[PDB]
From Swiss-Prot:
Active site: E35, D52
Phylogenetic placement of the source organism: Eukaryota, Metazoa, Chordata, Craniata, Vertebrata
Broad enzyme group: hydrolase
Protein name (Swiss-Prot/TrEMBL): Lysozyme C
UniProtKB keywords: Allergen, Antimicrobial, Bacteriolytic enzyme, Disulfide bond, Glycosidase, Hydrolase, Secreted, Signal
PANTHER family given in the database record: LYSOZYME C
GO molecular function: beta-N-acetylglucosaminidase activity; identical protein binding; lysozyme activity
InterPro entries: Glyco_hydro_22, Glyco_hydro_22_CS, Glyco_hydro_22_lys, Lysozyme-like_dom_sf
Chemical reaction(s) catalysed: Hydrolysis of (1->4)-beta-linkages between N-acetylmuramic acid and N-acetyl-D-glucosamine residues in a peptidoglycan and between N-acetyl-D-glucosamine residues in chitodextrins
PROSITE patterns the UniProt entry points to: GLYCOSYL_HYDROL_F22_1, GLYCOSYL_HYDROL_F22_2
SMART domains from the UniProt entry: LYZ1 (SM00263)
Sequence positions that bind substrate: D101
Miscellaneous section: Lysozyme C is capable of both hydrolysis and transglycosylation; it also shows a slight esterase activity. It acts rapidly on both peptide-substituted and unsubstituted peptidoglycan, and slowly on chitin oligosaccharides.
Length: 129
């Protein structure tokens, strides 16, 4: 599913991401924009053999099981395929664990490089939330 901008903002808010670990909703929408262009079915293969899945491009080395990432973990206790669903619950619940890991949203390199320190509230402007 490709979410609209305000549609994803509302879904993220409904699932409790607004201000989660102190990160305002615009931070989460901005991260999703540059990770996946709001497409739940986005995937990306990394040089080390791991794969990133879903709207927030969550990686199989630590967070989900795809059966093809040797030596990896599954800390969100989900198949990586669950991160591709039209229902964002699995991506949100796993992102909450990731952002609590110690480095906040810096875990998403694209957030650090493209969202951090910017006017992220622009990503939710105009939305009925
Ligand atoms: Cl957009
Ligand atoms: Cl915001
Ligand atoms: Cl594996
Ligand atoms: Cl599994
Ligand atoms: Cl933080
Ligand atoms: Na894994």
């Amino acid at each position: 599913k490709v979410f609209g901008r305000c549609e994803l903002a509302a879904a993220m808010k409904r699932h409790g991401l607004d201000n989660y670990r102190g990160y305002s909703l615009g931070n989460w929408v901005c991260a999703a924009k540059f990770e996946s262009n709001f497409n739940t079915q986005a995937t990306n293969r990394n040089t080390d053999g791991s794969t990133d899945y879903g709207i927030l491009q969550i990686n199989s080395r630590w967070w989900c099981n795809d059966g093809r990432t040797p030596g990896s973990r599954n800390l969100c206790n989900i198949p990586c395929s669950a991160l591709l669903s039209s229902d964002i619950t699995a991506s949100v619940n796993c992102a909450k664990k990731i952002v609590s890991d110690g480095n906040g949203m810096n875990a998403w390199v694209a957030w650090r490089n493209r969202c951090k320190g910017t006017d992220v509230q622009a990503w939710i402007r105009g939305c009925r939330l």
